[PDB]
Write a protein that binds this ligand. Structure first.
Ligand SMILES: Brc1ccc(Br)c2[nH]nnc12
Ligand SMILES: Brc1ccc(Br)c2[nH]nnc12
Ligand SMILES: [Cl-]
Ligand code: NA
Length: 333
């Protein structure tokens, strides 16, 4: 028999209740602007799918970020545009300002309202306890928002969090792997960066949901409170599940496999072995103990579960005692 079907615990049917045109990005008609409205100033970065530049809008002299898309399926480009348009104005979501083509090359580009190219990866191994809680809460605002809008990011990692530490402002960027959640849809498991991949991706369980982002968030949290980058340090996608199994234990892994009737790749048969579930105290030492509290460990434990349905939702996470002082200070301000 096949894998047991799965549904999101929250925001299950939000796209069903929308007009077709909200989520049917293949049918979306883009009005392409003129990249000659922008002059590129300098290169910020370069991923697999894009080169990113600081630029000037010559019309209003405003600084913007231009993301030149490396050639790719028209389908992926419409998906990213539609998701960015749907989420525009959401808390801690990057703002799409324009969609343009170079008049000569006809290469498509996305124009975003300016953010500094200071990613969380550059800052997140040097934060105070309070600032980890503060920025984690800001990321949760973006995730609860996109999940509530029927979208999963699928590439949550420190590089995709841009932070202005001076102004205590955060933006979740790079929506190029994001998808719409539809109940019963089987998704591509070749998403996310190795160290942040949820167990569903690693065992090829395709009927996943928003909870994938909550695993990635747990990987980030573990890295930061333990000063261990990355927390799960696999050599490849097979060894990645072994690194998880040595922490979360094999009993819960095989119970998860059984629960969803997952057909485990035979490569796993000799490498997973037999491992106890480790107490988090095992990762605490003199250099990180100031970042680790009962609150932090209780919260982390409820993000890093094999069973995607078990993980906290973004809103449940925001309700956790770990954030009580952040929530109190926000109200005060
Ligand atoms: Br690097 C970098 C900086 C700002 C934005 Br907005 C980005 N989007 N993708 N990569 C980005
Ligand atoms: Br990095 C970064 C993040 C969020 C905001 Br809002 C920013 N404004 N300038 N630079 C920013
Ligand atoms: Cl990263
Ligand atoms: Na401590």
């Amino acid at each position: 028999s096949g894998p047991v079907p799965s549904r999101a615990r929250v925001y299950t049917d939000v796209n069903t209740h929308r007009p077709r045109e909200y989520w049917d990005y293949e049918s979306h008609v883009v009005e392409w602007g003129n990249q000659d409205d922008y002059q590129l100033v300098r290169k910020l970065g370069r991923g697999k799918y894009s080169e990113v530049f600081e630029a000037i809008n010559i019309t209003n002299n405003e600084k913007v970020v231009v993301k030149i898309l490396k050639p790719v399926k028209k389908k992926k480009i419409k998906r990213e545009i539609k998701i960015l348009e749907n989420l525009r104005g959401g808390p801690n979501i990057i703002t799409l300002a324009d969609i343009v083509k170079d008049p000569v090359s006809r290469t498509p580009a996305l124009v975003f309202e300016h953010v500094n190219n200071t990613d969380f990866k550059q800052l997140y191994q040097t934060l105070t306890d309070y600032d980890i809680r503060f920025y984690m809460y800001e990321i949760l605002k973006a995730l609860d928002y996109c999940h509530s809008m029927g979208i999963m990011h699928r590439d949550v990692k420190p590089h995709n969090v841009m932070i202005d530490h001076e102004h205590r402002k955060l933006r979740l960027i790079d929506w190029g792997l994001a998808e719409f959640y539809h109940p019963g849809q089987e998704y591509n498991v070749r998403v996310a960066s190795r160290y942040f991949k949820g167990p569903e991706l690693l065992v090829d369980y395709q009927m996943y949901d928003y909870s994938l982002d909550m695993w990635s968030l747990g990987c980030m949290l573990a890295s930061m409170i333990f000063r261990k980058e990355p927390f799960f340090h696999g050599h490849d996608n097979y060894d990645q599940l072994v690194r998880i199994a040595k922490v979360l234990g094999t009993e819960d892994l095989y119970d998860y496999i059984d629960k969803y009737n997952i057909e485990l790749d035979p490569r796993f048969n000799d490498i997973l072995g037999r491992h106890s579930r480790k107490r988090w105290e095992r990762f605490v030492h003199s250099e990180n103990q100031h970042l680790v509290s009962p609150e932090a460990l209780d919260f982390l434990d409820k993000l890093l579960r094999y069973d995607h349905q078990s993980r906290l939702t973004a809103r449940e996470a925001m309700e956790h005692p770990y954030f009580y002082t952040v929530v109190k200070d926000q109200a005060r301000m």
